[PDB]
Amino acid sequence: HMQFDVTIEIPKGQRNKYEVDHETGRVRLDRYLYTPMAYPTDYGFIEDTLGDDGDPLDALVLLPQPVFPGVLVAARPVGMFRMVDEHGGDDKVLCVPAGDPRWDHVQDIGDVPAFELDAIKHFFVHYKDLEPGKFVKAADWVDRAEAEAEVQRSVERFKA
Amino acid sequence: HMQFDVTIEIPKGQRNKYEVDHETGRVRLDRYLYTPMAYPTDYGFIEDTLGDDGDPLDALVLLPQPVFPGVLVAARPVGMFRMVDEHGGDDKVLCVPAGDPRWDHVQDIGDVPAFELDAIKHFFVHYKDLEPGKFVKAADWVDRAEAEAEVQRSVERFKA
Amino acid sequence: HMQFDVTIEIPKGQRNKYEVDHETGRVRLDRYLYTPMAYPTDYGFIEDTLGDDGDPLDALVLLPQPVFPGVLVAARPVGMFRMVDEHGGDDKVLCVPAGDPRWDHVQDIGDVPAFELDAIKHFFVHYKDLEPGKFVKAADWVDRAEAEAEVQRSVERFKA
Amino acid sequence: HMQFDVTIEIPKGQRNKYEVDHETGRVRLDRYLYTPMAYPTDYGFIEDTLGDDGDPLDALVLLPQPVFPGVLVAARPVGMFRMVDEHGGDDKVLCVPAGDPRWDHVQDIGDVPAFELDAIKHFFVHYKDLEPGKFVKAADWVDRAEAEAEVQRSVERFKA
Amino acid sequence: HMQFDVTIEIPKGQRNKYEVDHETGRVRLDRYLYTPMAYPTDYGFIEDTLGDDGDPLDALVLLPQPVFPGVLVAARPVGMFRMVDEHGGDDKVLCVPAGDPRWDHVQDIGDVPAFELDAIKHFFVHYKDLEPGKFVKAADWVDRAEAEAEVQRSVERFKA
Amino acid sequence: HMQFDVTIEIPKGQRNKYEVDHETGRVRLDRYLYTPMAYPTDYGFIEDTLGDDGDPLDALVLLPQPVFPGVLVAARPVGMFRMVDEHGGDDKVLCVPAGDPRWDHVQDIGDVPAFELDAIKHFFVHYKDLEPGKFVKAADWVDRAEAEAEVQRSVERFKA
């Protein structure tokens, strides 16, 4: 039943790291990546969340065609990439479009093929390899229930 | 003499149906189309209108090169696709860029070739063929005068 | 076990109908489609076949990213779109990349979702709607065994 | 030390002249160019400036990959294209991304190759050749110090 | 009645000057243009011609969507850009797709708007402005009859 | 003085690994990469070479704009990425366009910034991380003289 709006900052296939300045809603180029890598899925954040790192809760959205930076997509969670890096906690909720029956076979983390999960993991483990002062201390996939709990606490913190 | 601003939601060639949330101005992905079709022209709505269905009045803009979702174009009407579907009234005002002399030969509906009008009609008749609970009860091209009258009543309703 | 080379003429998303002149191997623009439609998959033909219509046997290839006109892909069949139209027999063998374990769950026609099969069918039923003298008398999905038999007889005829 | 935010209106390679309506922040298509030319760099304006013509101060940003219309980039100046045309003063501050060590060899106007400066000049001298009532009375490259002084007076005027 | 095959070397919108090595049929990058310009139409040459400069006769093809380098298009002439430059004679036959009724209103040079002809001329007059040792001594539009005569003598020379 | 023709198989930014079948000259999709990586430069091979692994000698070409698969570029070497992996020797000659004065400041390996060399290295070290049975035993940059010697022995072997 859980769904939420994701703002996509970075379309799949991008090496330009876009993002939003959350005070204004403007889209910003943070940087061009230093590695020859590209975002593996459309990437952004869940609107109206205050996450575990004090930032909006990040999201990955599986789509048949990418969007543009700044576009909203109603999404539902199917799992989460738990990661601790130099920022601190840096989890990414894995999502599919909400209300779209083409995605109904994808309900939980076991419904996403390992080839896809492994490629996503590889991106986050390596994309900052050529930036100084970066590290990854934990990176693991967890299930929809864990994802939903993180979204829930982050919605509550935003409202608090 | 009539001109108005159109916000383009969907560039020509798109199968992603973008959209604007009119309460906020945000661009949203409504859905990926279920048919192997693509918008035949840049598509969006006329700013500051309250149309016949209680929604902003839709517009099609003929252009030499598409824009991006959310971009404004000053436009003038040359005709209108009158359609009744499952939404109710669902007219699309056909437009060209205002103030651009390259378009001065296009003044009314007879100035747009049948091949183009027929392709536009085909899109709207078929793009929802693989969605349940959709229908098209009337679909016909009408002239600039009819278009202008619809814009006019919709500008008035918005202001009311 | 069956695999073959497909030459892709038309990448997914194209309204330019490319395609090969089989006497020379050159890529040709046949025409821009008359409907606001776009090829639903990468599309082309199986090399070294002489099909049921006396032409190379057509193929559809499911891919994570389209190719360019003229590119070869080693493919294996998973089913076939049987169609009779104004050309005569006009079957399209549905394929996935051969030797790619990411596709191992797709073995036969039941492994491709109805939403995808229906969209492909819709394309072939409608893309010539605005061309004179076109028709579709039969259009149905059949299984891998039927596909393989058609490939086999077409390889034999080419060699004969 | 000087840096500022540039809003890119027009990505490198565009013939669509996008954009910002400064009263609302909306992106608008001004026009399709009348010449077969394309913006030589990402192009836009410096936020929070009131320039010599009473408009926001224009900026060119050198980048490894273009952005989208409306995107912010933190930039630092390395020189300026001084031009007087039919608008009046129409200077363009030449910039590189701020805080990006890949650009540290570019500090002043002599660090940008003549081939690049000449191509940029050529664009501004010629892109309006097929529009009536246009002219260019002065077009010359000046150094970072001149650029910084113009930015400074324009920041002050905006604040005044 | 005249038609011929054009090989498109350079799609509309390109700054890469592709392309064919006529001895092999391979596509080559000649150079990236030195000016911030882009080919105004799809551009290439007429197959099986030996033109006035001893090279294949160049062609411009008006299309609703560009092709890829190396693609053939059956075309018919509607006029010609006569030019003398540093190569010598350097005429470009202006064409539309043959057998395509969407183009039937375009028969001769007067059927192509001045805005389009002027933009094409502008490209050829200026694209080599920043290359040494280039010049344009004559550049004028001529009619279909002149174009057809040039094609005819070039077909004859190729065969001779 | 050394120059040669490179056939580009893979444009910069690609995750499709194109590719040439050297017996026919056809372009083939080998595979979609298994990692979220993209070729860091245009990539291909030097024509008329028989390299150290018994295959054509691979090349990387620095360009302002990518080409298409199968396109020739006259190139000159400026260094080489020496690598031993599961294939055996797998060197990539680093090149710039020959005869193009915009590249005259790039003569040897020290003229290419470390950020760029490091990104290229990162690609080759990591792009097969999620393929079984792959390894990299040596990966280092060497100078133009080493590159030229490898090209020379490979031209000789091809001719032998």
PDB file of C-alpha atoms in Angstrom, chain C:
ATOM      1  CA  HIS C   1      20.187 -24.620 -28.856  1.00  0.00           C
ATOM      2  CA  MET C   2      19.129 -22.676 -31.985  1.00  0.00           C
ATOM      3  CA  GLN C   3      20.841 -19.348 -32.564  1.00  0.00           C
ATOM      4  CA  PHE C   4      21.426 -17.128 -35.576  1.00  0.00           C
ATOM      5  CA  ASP C   5      22.595 -13.664 -36.525  1.00  0.00           C
ATOM      6  CA  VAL C   6      20.013 -10.918 -36.796  1.00  0.00           C
ATOM      7  CA  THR C   7      20.813  -7.725 -38.672  1.00  0.00           C
ATOM      8  CA  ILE C   8      18.937  -4.926 -36.945  1.00  0.00           C
ATOM      9  CA  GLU C   9      17.562  -2.483 -39.473  1.00  0.00           C
ATOM     10  CA  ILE C  10      15.426  -0.362 -37.166  1.00  0.00           C
ATOM     11  CA  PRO C  11      16.275   0.473 -33.555  1.00  0.00           C
ATOM     12  CA  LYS C  12      13.501   0.561 -30.998  1.00  0.00           C
ATOM     13  CA  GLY C  13      11.799   3.948 -30.960  1.00  0.00           C
ATOM     14  CA  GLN C  14      12.195   4.759 -34.648  1.00  0.00           C
ATOM     15  CA  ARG C  15       9.667   6.291 -36.998  1.00  0.00           C
ATOM     16  CA  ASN C  16      12.234   6.117 -39.843  1.00  0.00           C
ATOM     17  CA  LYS C  17      11.691   2.783 -41.549  1.00  0.00           C
ATOM     18  CA  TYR C  18      15.160   1.635 -42.520  1.00  0.00           C
ATOM     19  CA  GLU C  19      15.713  -1.473 -44.612  1.00  0.00           C
ATOM     20  CA  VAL C  20      18.708  -3.265 -46.036  1.00  0.00           C
ATOM     21  CA  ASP C  21      19.049  -3.625 -49.803  1.00  0.00           C
ATOM     22  CA  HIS C  22      19.858  -7.377 -49.693  1.00  0.00           C
ATOM     23  CA  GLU C  23      21.782  -7.340 -53.002  1.00  0.00           C
ATOM     24  CA  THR C  24      24.420  -4.912 -51.611  1.00  0.00           C
ATOM     25  CA  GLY C  25      24.081  -4.806 -47.810  1.00  0.00           C
ATOM     26  CA  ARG C  26      23.455  -1.027 -47.935  1.00  0.00           C
ATOM     27  CA  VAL C  27      21.050   0.542 -45.429  1.00  0.00           C
ATOM     28  CA  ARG C  28      18.214   2.513 -47.033  1.00  0.00           C
ATOM     29  CA  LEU C  29      15.481   4.748 -45.698  1.00  0.00           C
ATOM     30  CA  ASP C  30      12.344   3.129 -47.063  1.00  0.00           C
ATOM     31  CA  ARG C  31      10.075   5.818 -45.669  1.00  0.00           C
ATOM     32  CA  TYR C  32       9.122   7.913 -42.686  1.00  0.00           C
ATOM     33  CA  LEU C  33       6.029   6.238 -41.184  1.00  0.00           C
ATOM     34  CA  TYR C  34       2.687   7.892 -41.846  1.00  0.00           C
ATOM     35  CA  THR C  35       1.384   7.163 -38.347  1.00  0.00           C
ATOM     36  CA  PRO C  36       2.680   8.568 -35.036  1.00  0.00           C
ATOM     37  CA  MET C  37       4.138   5.219 -34.092  1.00  0.00           C
ATOM     38  CA  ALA C  38       7.598   3.887 -33.389  1.00  0.00           C
ATOM     39  CA  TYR C  39       9.086   0.415 -33.628  1.00  0.00           C
ATOM     40  CA  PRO C  40       8.440  -1.363 -30.335  1.00  0.00           C
ATOM     41  CA  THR C  41      11.643  -3.407 -30.344  1.00  0.00           C
ATOM     42  CA  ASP C  42      14.801  -3.474 -32.386  1.00  0.00           C
ATOM     43  CA  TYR C  43      13.696  -4.905 -35.727  1.00  0.00           C
ATOM     44  CA  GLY C  44      15.441  -6.525 -38.650  1.00  0.00           C
ATOM     45  CA  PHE C  45      15.987  -9.873 -40.325  1.00  0.00           C
ATOM     46  CA  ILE C  46      17.774 -13.138 -39.872  1.00  0.00           C
ATOM     47  CA  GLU C  47      20.893 -13.453 -41.995  1.00  0.00           C
ATOM     48  CA  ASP C  48      21.021 -16.279 -44.547  1.00  0.00           C
ATOM     49  CA  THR C  49      17.286 -16.916 -44.649  1.00  0.00           C
ATOM     50  CA  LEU C  50      14.791 -17.194 -47.456  1.00  0.00           C
ATOM     51  CA  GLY C  51      11.418 -16.956 -45.757  1.00  0.00           C
ATOM     52  CA  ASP C  52       7.780 -17.837 -46.548  1.00  0.00           C
ATOM     53  CA  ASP C  53       7.232 -14.635 -48.609  1.00  0.00           C
ATOM     54  CA  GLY C  54      10.487 -15.112 -50.581  1.00  0.00           C
ATOM     55  CA  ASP C  55      12.146 -12.383 -48.434  1.00  0.00           C
ATOM     56  CA  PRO C  56      14.590 -12.691 -45.497  1.00  0.00           C
ATOM     57  CA  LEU C  57      12.797 -13.795 -42.327  1.00  0.00           C
ATOM     58  CA  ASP C  58      12.025 -10.805 -40.106  1.00  0.00           C
ATOM     59  CA  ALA C  59      13.083 -10.674 -36.453  1.00  0.00           C
ATOM     60  CA  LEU C  60      12.353  -8.658 -33.331  1.00  0.00           C
ATOM     61  CA  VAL C  61      15.115  -8.579 -30.711  1.00  0.00           C
ATOM     62  CA  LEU C  62      14.505  -7.690 -27.070  1.00  0.00           C
ATOM     63  CA  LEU C  63      17.459  -5.667 -25.751  1.00  0.00           C
ATOM     64  CA  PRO C  64      18.336  -3.476 -22.761  1.00  0.00           C
ATOM     65  CA  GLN C  65      19.612  -0.755 -25.154  1.00  0.00           C
ATOM     66  CA  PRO C  66      18.966  -0.343 -28.877  1.00  0.00           C
ATOM     67  CA  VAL C  67      21.646  -0.711 -31.532  1.00  0.00           C
ATOM     68  CA  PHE C  68      22.215   1.233 -34.804  1.00  0.00           C
ATOM     69  CA  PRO C  69      20.895   0.312 -38.266  1.00  0.00           C
ATOM     70  CA  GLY C  70      23.020  -2.438 -39.780  1.00  0.00           C
ATOM     71  CA  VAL C  71      24.335  -3.961 -36.556  1.00  0.00           C
ATOM     72  CA  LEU C  72      24.500  -7.754 -36.106  1.00  0.00           C
ATOM     73  CA  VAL C  73      23.265  -9.444 -32.942  1.00  0.00           C
ATOM     74  CA  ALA C  74      23.582 -13.171 -32.205  1.00  0.00           C
ATOM     75  CA  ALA C  75      20.070 -14.095 -31.118  1.00  0.00           C
ATOM     76  CA  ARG C  76      17.893 -17.036 -30.128  1.00  0.00           C
ATOM     77  CA  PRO C  77      14.188 -17.396 -30.753  1.00  0.00           C
ATOM     78  CA  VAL C  78      11.513 -17.421 -28.022  1.00  0.00           C
ATOM     79  CA  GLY C  79       8.346 -17.188 -30.138  1.00  0.00           C
ATOM     80  CA  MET C  80       6.962 -15.560 -33.275  1.00  0.00           C
ATOM     81  CA  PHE C  81       4.365 -13.049 -34.400  1.00  0.00           C
ATOM     82  CA  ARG C  82       2.475 -14.768 -37.215  1.00  0.00           C
ATOM     83  CA  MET C  83       0.871 -12.260 -39.511  1.00  0.00           C
ATOM     84  CA  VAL C  84      -0.700 -12.196 -42.963  1.00  0.00           C
ATOM     85  CA  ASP C  85      -0.944  -8.743 -44.505  1.00  0.00           C
ATOM     86  CA  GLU C  86      -0.881  -7.162 -48.003  1.00  0.00           C
ATOM     87  CA  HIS C  87       2.676  -8.522 -48.608  1.00  0.00           C
ATOM     88  CA  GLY C  88       1.475 -12.027 -47.929  1.00  0.00           C
ATOM     89  CA  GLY C  89       3.069 -13.884 -45.050  1.00  0.00           C
ATOM     90  CA  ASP C  90       4.904 -11.530 -42.839  1.00  0.00           C
ATOM     91  CA  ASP C  91       6.049 -13.346 -39.745  1.00  0.00           C
ATOM     92  CA  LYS C  92       8.406 -11.794 -37.182  1.00  0.00           C
ATOM     93  CA  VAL C  93      10.552 -14.122 -35.053  1.00  0.00           C
ATOM     94  CA  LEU C  94      10.816 -12.831 -31.444  1.00  0.00           C
ATOM     95  CA  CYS C  95      14.314 -13.159 -30.075  1.00  0.00           C
ATOM     96  CA  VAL C  96      16.658 -12.441 -27.192  1.00  0.00           C
ATOM     97  CA  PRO C  97      20.465 -12.156 -27.211  1.00  0.00           C
ATOM     98  CA  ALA C  98      22.150 -15.548 -27.430  1.00  0.00           C
ATOM     99  CA  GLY C  99      24.743 -16.464 -24.833  1.00  0.00           C
ATOM    100  CA  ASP C 100      23.597 -13.765 -22.423  1.00  0.00           C
ATOM    101  CA  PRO C 101      22.584 -15.226 -19.054  1.00  0.00           C
ATOM    102  CA  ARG C 102      20.536 -12.132 -18.234  1.00  0.00           C
ATOM    103  CA  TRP C 103      17.952 -13.491 -20.667  1.00  0.00           C
ATOM    104  CA  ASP C 104      17.918 -17.111 -19.465  1.00  0.00           C
ATOM    105  CA  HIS C 105      14.457 -16.748 -17.872  1.00  0.00           C
ATOM    106  CA  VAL C 106      13.052 -16.016 -21.344  1.00  0.00           C
ATOM    107  CA  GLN C 107      12.740 -19.336 -23.182  1.00  0.00           C
ATOM    108  CA  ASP C 108       9.295 -19.384 -24.772  1.00  0.00           C
ATOM    109  CA  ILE C 109       6.431 -17.100 -25.585  1.00  0.00           C
ATOM    110  CA  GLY C 110       4.797 -17.380 -22.172  1.00  0.00           C
ATOM    111  CA  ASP C 111       7.894 -15.803 -20.622  1.00  0.00           C
ATOM    112  CA  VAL C 112       7.239 -12.435 -22.341  1.00  0.00           C
ATOM    113  CA  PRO C 113       4.577 -10.327 -20.563  1.00  0.00           C
ATOM    114  CA  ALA C 114       1.281  -9.734 -22.310  1.00  0.00           C
ATOM    115  CA  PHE C 115       1.760  -5.959 -22.005  1.00  0.00           C
ATOM    116  CA  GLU C 116       4.835  -6.272 -24.241  1.00  0.00           C
ATOM    117  CA  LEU C 117       3.345  -8.754 -26.709  1.00  0.00           C
ATOM    118  CA  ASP C 118       0.195  -6.671 -26.967  1.00  0.00           C
ATOM    119  CA  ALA C 119       2.198  -3.469 -27.652  1.00  0.00           C
ATOM    120  CA  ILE C 120       4.172  -5.243 -30.386  1.00  0.00           C
ATOM    121  CA  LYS C 121       0.966  -6.537 -31.942  1.00  0.00           C
ATOM    122  CA  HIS C 122      -0.565  -3.067 -31.778  1.00  0.00           C
ATOM    123  CA  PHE C 123       2.351  -1.645 -33.715  1.00  0.00           C
ATOM    124  CA  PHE C 124       2.028  -4.091 -36.591  1.00  0.00           C
ATOM    125  CA  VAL C 125      -1.766  -3.841 -36.699  1.00  0.00           C
ATOM    126  CA  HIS C 126      -1.773  -0.028 -36.837  1.00  0.00           C
ATOM    127  CA  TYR C 127       1.459   1.420 -38.236  1.00  0.00           C
ATOM    128  CA  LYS C 128       0.212   1.344 -41.837  1.00  0.00           C
ATOM    129  CA  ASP C 129      -3.300   2.615 -40.997  1.00  0.00           C
ATOM    130  CA  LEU C 130      -2.671   5.856 -42.956  1.00  0.00           C
ATOM    131  CA  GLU C 131      -1.126   4.163 -46.019  1.00  0.00           C
ATOM    132  CA  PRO C 132      -3.451   3.133 -48.865  1.00  0.00           C
ATOM    133  CA  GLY C 133      -3.918  -0.492 -49.869  1.00  0.00           C
ATOM    134  CA  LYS C 134      -2.757  -2.090 -46.627  1.00  0.00           C
ATOM    135  CA  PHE C 135      -4.447  -4.789 -44.590  1.00  0.00           C
ATOM    136  CA  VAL C 136      -3.917  -7.362 -41.807  1.00  0.00           C
ATOM    137  CA  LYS C 137      -5.819 -10.680 -42.234  1.00  0.00           C
ATOM    138  CA  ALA C 138      -4.262 -12.655 -39.352  1.00  0.00           C
ATOM    139  CA  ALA C 139      -2.035 -11.602 -36.440  1.00  0.00           C
ATOM    140  CA  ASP C 140      -1.247 -14.035 -33.600  1.00  0.00           C
ATOM    141  CA  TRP C 141       1.556 -15.071 -31.291  1.00  0.00           C
ATOM    142  CA  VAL C 142       2.961 -18.571 -31.586  1.00  0.00           C
ATOM    143  CA  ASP C 143       5.549 -20.475 -29.626  1.00  0.00           C
ATOM    144  CA  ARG C 144       9.271 -21.115 -29.908  1.00  0.00           C
ATOM    145  CA  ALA C 145       8.797 -24.467 -31.631  1.00  0.00           C
ATOM    146  CA  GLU C 146       6.827 -22.847 -34.460  1.00  0.00           C
ATOM    147  CA  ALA C 147       9.448 -20.108 -34.692  1.00  0.00           C
ATOM    148  CA  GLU C 148      12.305 -22.575 -34.874  1.00  0.00           C
ATOM    149  CA  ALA C 149      10.567 -24.554 -37.602  1.00  0.00           C
ATOM    150  CA  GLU C 150      10.164 -21.395 -39.691  1.00  0.00           C
ATOM    151  CA  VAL C 151      13.775 -20.449 -39.203  1.00  0.00           C
ATOM    152  CA  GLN C 152      14.813 -23.968 -40.142  1.00  0.00           C
ATOM    153  CA  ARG C 153      12.834 -24.102 -43.402  1.00  0.00           C
ATOM    154  CA  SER C 154      14.131 -20.607 -44.259  1.00  0.00           C
ATOM    155  CA  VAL C 155      17.749 -21.546 -43.686  1.00  0.00           C
ATOM    156  CA  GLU C 156      17.182 -24.581 -45.915  1.00  0.00           C
ATOM    157  CA  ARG C 157      15.574 -22.527 -48.698  1.00  0.00           C
ATOM    158  CA  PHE C 158      18.428 -20.013 -48.602  1.00  0.00           C
ATOM    159  CA  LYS C 159      20.921 -22.839 -49.054  1.00  0.00           C
ATOM    160  CA  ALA C 160      18.874 -24.582 -51.786  1.00  0.00           C
TER     161      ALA C 160
END
